[model samples]
Target chain A: GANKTVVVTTILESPYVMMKKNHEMLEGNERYEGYCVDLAAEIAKHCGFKYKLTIVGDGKYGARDADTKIWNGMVGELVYGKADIAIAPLTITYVREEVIDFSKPFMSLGISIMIKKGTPIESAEDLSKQTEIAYGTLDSGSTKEFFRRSKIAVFDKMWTYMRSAEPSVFVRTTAEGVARVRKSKGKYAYLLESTMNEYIEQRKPCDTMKVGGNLDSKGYGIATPKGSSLGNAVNLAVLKLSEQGLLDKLKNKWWYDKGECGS
Target chain B: KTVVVTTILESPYVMMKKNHEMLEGNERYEGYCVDLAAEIAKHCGFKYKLTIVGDGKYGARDADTKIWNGMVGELVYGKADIAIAPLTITYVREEVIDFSKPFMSLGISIMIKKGTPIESAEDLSKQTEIAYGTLDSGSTKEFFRRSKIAVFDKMWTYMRSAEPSVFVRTTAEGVARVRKSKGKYAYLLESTMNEYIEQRKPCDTMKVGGNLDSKGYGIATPKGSSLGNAVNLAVLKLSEQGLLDKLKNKWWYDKGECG
Candidate 1:
């Protein structure tokens, strides 16, 4: 055995990462659970490494500061050597890839729109044409970037509306965005990661629905700081798990069984 | 007065015309649905502005919080006078709003990578590796949720356990995921949406399996709204005049001729 215990940093996202109600009764990594947890275990097993789970302090996942050109959250932990690897829903953006290395994506996801039901919206064209309902994205996230860089006709039109809208469209964390949808009734719509949207749909009362289509395409990867020793092993482990159907099994356990979207 | 019509920019649906400064209503926007909107507007004797919906998702009931958005939301509230988009008429939608006679009939279909091993909903049940979920809580979700059949029940079980990441939030996300996953993930969505997307430029995705069920798209208006009756009649008039099929072909099939 090596002296190093690979410290993997992750966040607590439902159906992806959560402590079981009786976490204390469980052993080892079993204390914590979810898709990412299962994935971390598989990666560690295949790579033949002992690992410790550490939650990121800032509570932010991967995000960029355009002004500083620096990455923060779990992504930062990897870049700064605070953690050895990251196997959460870390998106492989060009900006992040510049600083850290990523495995071939184990899973694909995109930024999608979540709205309270019964608003008169069906497609992006409706947003461009209507004036009643307002929309925005979580602050400093991929969805905002999608709108910023979009060239598609509807996205371009949506950009015009978002930039020029009178009431100042909202921007907040993904949690805040979900809360806003719950509280705003049908007036506000939040664009966030598709995984989160699906999880919330299985939650209690399950009144929110993802609307429109995804604006961009990307995937979640096992991330390592540039030149980390564990990068190759983790990458290989992910591919193996994917092919073995273990990844799929983990996804169902976390997302479907405990999902809150339509609970 | 400018009426705010919520829509999305699919190819040939409601794209902006080149040299738009010179074009009029029918000429300004020239997709199948856009032309239909123009015809409906003409029949209704109204001039309306085209507004694209910000998010490209179908309307559905959200059980967590008691509110609605999307095209159904537009009609439920007073935001839009009438929805002339390819808005499907579901029983749930009809419970809260009114719809014109169906303009187009379609069924729900599954789309996957070209060689996906899945041939039926039953195939989805046997495999644990390839998990499937509907577009959040759209009609597809309801179809699986409410079905009494074995395949639906099995699908419900598989989806219930599918990793959160595998469950999709929107049709576009599902399609993109299927394309990216390359047969590992399949999307269950409306036949129209699946067919329409299949015809697009990247047409890497294809519809699989026979339709699970059939449905129709109607011009929806909010319950007790003033425009409900007039819009219904306008839709009927347009259907009778052969403009409906013309519009469907124009937007749904025109690709890039006018844009």
Candidate 2:
């Protein structure tokens, strides 16, 4: 029997985490599958901790409000003590860094611009310069914040243009962004993190390519509340995974290896 | 009235014209910092000319002679109306020249040669046998000085006591020191500088150790300058609009036919 149990808060991102159709039939941690599932197992193994995987309740991962200092989603779980740690693709941002501690980036990625093939928009600069080809990012997410906090001329101009655009070019989630892109027939482009973009690009009816270099510089880090003794352990586990090439293995398995998707 | 803007010649921040005698800001201006200056001037309704600082080093706090100079010096001594380089915001720098609401947020991080034993800041602090220090009198030095919690404070004490010879003079020097010294010496610097150095050609360095603290680069102006209020708001507006990040990537990462 384990003396200490760590509860990990996660989100339901495709290829990263998903609930099994027969999740109830699959007891314990088997209820979830994908890259995050495998990653959590390996991390727990290295840290010598028992964990229960729970999805974030509010659907958001982390967000900042200029008016209020509320950071909700998985980051909220850790901040409010609802969860002991988070092992999802949560980005390391300044606002989140104030409340929670992030381990060294377990994965490296940028906010990629996702467009359906044959779209005229090739980079963020292109999106900035062209008005007919409207593009936006998932609202209340890191990608949105990256644009909100951008300092470049073109992106600044683009931000003004997107915020006041005719249709209002923002979505609530990655799924919604992808749907808009698919439905727009190249009129709309979705800005998302590279991890999700790469995963979606592999699936059938692949209609997107990660256009433009990453809009911002950041990476995905395992999160824990400040002062948690588990911080060092998790950081070490991530480094171990990186050094052993296990992180790449999991990435390939989920993104490139094309294993069957869980129903 | 032409506002004098002091800046450095770092790649993607400011660069010199091939024909060095051109005094016009518009003719010589390029890169993110150049564009930022132009936007700030437009937002603030000012005409400005870019003037290169005489010293190449980033502003530093000197205890011996009791003089604060360099980019910060230029602003403090009334030589320039503002400084628009990638100058980091440190507690020491904040004391003399008032900075706008930081145009960009940054933190202190470590750059290590690949395959180093250390992966996190705690790893570096745990080993007393290993030696490490930041670029002398830079943001990393200030972070260690101002920190009061976690592994950073402990590392701060270690770095202060370590031989002065170990301290690096510049970010480039610190990175080269890490590459040559392997895991023995970890170079701590601003995250932006860390990433910028990482993207350079022949870069053998990678940022390690999660950023230890948070601060932002403000458009530093002389204390009590009336321009501070408008500049800060302009920065916030630009930040909210996402122009700041776009400019950073354009100057730092984007390699197109335009350069």
Candidate 3:
């Protein structure tokens, strides 16, 4: 069955999706190597299609602009019919659900508080209960969205505090958040997904620790446009991969087994 | 008609209030599920009576008889109208009962004493230096007991056949074992409990590694119970309104001892 190349849109999130160090010498998908790259290969094998891995132009996970009502990032490419599927770490939020077809969750994660090793904070409650230090999440991701939309007491209290923090607590990226945490000298705690938190904790300068449990549970999904022809195949592929234990293998390969920190 | 609610006496999920001696029926309990029951009752317009399950289990299908026991049994056998507790929504339970969207969610995770050589599941599975076990009954135990996943299955086999029985009768007991084992033992329990215990004083135990599996707790009813549809809708509305999360903070973290 001869068919066109399935365009896969993703972001350059470390370990999940990343460009190889020697990418200058590699061409096409070979330029990348990470969990999602391996996953895309498995998915393509199962679905019987070849795919071109392309980075999302906007570099955003995906969100809709309130004024224009337009989707941007990998989700945008899918919505506009530019990319056939998204195989990165895009989350399954309610807003995204309205315009895209998402496979059953490929992975599960939750917002967690990451603190400097000796920070007095043990949980988000620690931050919420006192203002000894400031805490914030990525300015735009679902982590921030949770607080913005939250009517819950602790989260709502946290939102009230963050939304009005004078110097701006929110970071533009996880890297920025981590940098802020390291530099703030126990003055700032960054809230992010457990997966990324755990990843960064394993990296060099491992003075940061992901404290407390995730605030809430959510899942990440492989996404397609509202009615893409590849939706069924991609969804089935995800289910098969999970049942066959490929997802767990992929996660372990990227997260735990590669820890730079001494065990 | 009063909806008969079945719940367990698990801490922070459902428990008798300090003043329970002066209270009666649903008034006796105050915890996550208790607050949730009040919210669902308000939305569903039903009066309910809260009672602890007589056998005090989370409900599991007996492998030999195919009959369910615990809170789930109370529902299936027409002894309860709805169940609001830390009842995990599992595939086996779903076949016999209807569940609302998760009122709360959790996963199986490890609690290790500080300085334990095991930092992750791989660490534990790859060595016998530290012994580990889960609560004797519930989905957490069932996960390892019935797992088809290689890592989990191997761990299950190890725990089942350990020289001294590793499984504990209660979560508190598991936490105690982790604390007293002095790095000799690790306990596997829900992350919710692990996190809660992590923040408690004498908090020598820590949740290391990620959870083993993902699942959620749901408001349950016997299949096709008349209260099912209304109760489910109430849970969703409460979730959307952030009440579920709010209630969690009230019980778990707001009053957290260490925090």
- Candidates in order, TM-scores: namely 0.51, 0.54, 0.62
**Runs of candidate 2 exceeding 4 Å displacement:** A259-263, B1-259
For candidate 1, write residues B143-196 as lDDT tens digits: 677665677777887776777756676566888888888678888888877777
Cα lDDT tens digits for candidate 3, B152-190 = 888988999998999887788888888888899999899
> Candidate 1 chain A vs. true chain A: TM-score?
0.87
Model 3 chain A: ten consecutive residues of lowest lDDT: A236-245
Candidate number with greatest TM-score: 3
Q: Chain A TM-score per candidate?
A: 0.87, 0.93, 0.96
Could you tell which candidate, 1 or 2, scores higher by DockQ? 2
Q: Which CAPRI tier for candidate 3? A: incorrect
Query: Ten residues in a row with the worst lDDT in model 2 chain A?
Result: A254-263
Interface RMSD, per-candidate values to 1 decimal: 20.2, 12.4, 5.0
A-chain TM-score, model 3 = 0.96
Writing each residue's lDDT as its tens digit, candidate 2 over A1-263 gives: 44678999998888889887899889878899988999999999998988999998988888856688767889878988999999898987666666787765667667788898999877888888777778887776777776666666776787788788777789877889899988998999887888888788877687777787876555688999988989867876875565445777788888877733323
Off by over 4 Å in 1: A22-31, A151-153, A156-172, A258-263, B1-118, B121-259
Rank by TM-score (best first): 3, 2, 1
Model 3, position B97, has a per-residue lDDT of: 84
Top DockQ model = 3
The lDDT ranking, best first, is: 3, 2, 1
**lDDT value for model 2:** 0.77
